[PDB]
Design a protein around this ligand. Structure first.
Ligand SMILES: [Cu+2]
Length: 181
């Protein structure tokens, strides 16, 4: 139940959401409940010659705002008005209160650069993350349901049972939760 919490534009983070955070060696933080699962995922990738890093875990409200504002600025520089930019940025960065990053349940995983390319990490994760309870949260073929663009770096902990079902039936989290009730 706990790891199946739905957070998106229609489901904000609950008001007094408690989370205990573990600090990784790079200073990023995650929900302490997902720690051994993320550790196992990283160990397994490295046993396969794939070297990922956690580019972003937990974010405070203000951090989310800033990430979003930066995405808005990028669209403004490419010829969007302020209003247009804000709407387009939402397809990539959630408004504060609606990011999975604010749960500590989501990590953006990149390649280390030296040993692996992005695409080798993204491919490995797509094919293996579910065995560690993580799903590719925003897949290209579910944008019409999730509201979010293809983000091959963004992985969400839901637990092994749910992740495996979601993987084999080719679902997004919203669809899985709908079919659970
Ligand atoms: Cu993310």
């Amino acid at each position: 139940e706990w790891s199946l919490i739905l957070v998106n534009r229609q489901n904000p983070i609950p008001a007094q959401y408690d989370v205990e955070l573990e600090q990784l060696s790079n200073g990023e933080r995650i929900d302490i409940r997902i720690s051994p699962y993320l550790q196992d995922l990283f160990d397994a990738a490295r046993a396969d010659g794939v070297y990922p890093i956690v580019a972003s875990g937990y974010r405070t409200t203000e951090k989310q705002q800033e990430i979003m504002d930066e995405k808005v600025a990028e669209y403004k520089a490419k010829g969007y008005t302020s209003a247009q930019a804000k709407a387009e940025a939402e397809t990539w960065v959630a408004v504060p209160g609606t990011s999975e990053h604010q749960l500590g349940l989501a990590v953006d995983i990149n390649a280390d650069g030296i040993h692996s390319t992005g695409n080798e990490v993204y491919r490995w994760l797509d094919e293996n993350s579910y065995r560690f309870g993580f799903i590719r949260r925003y897949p290209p073929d579910k944008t019409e349901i999730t509201g979010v663009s293809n983000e091959p770096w963004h992985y969400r902990y839901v637990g092994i049972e749910a992740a495996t079902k979601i993987y084999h039936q080719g679902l997004c989290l919203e669809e899985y939760l709908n079919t659970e009730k």
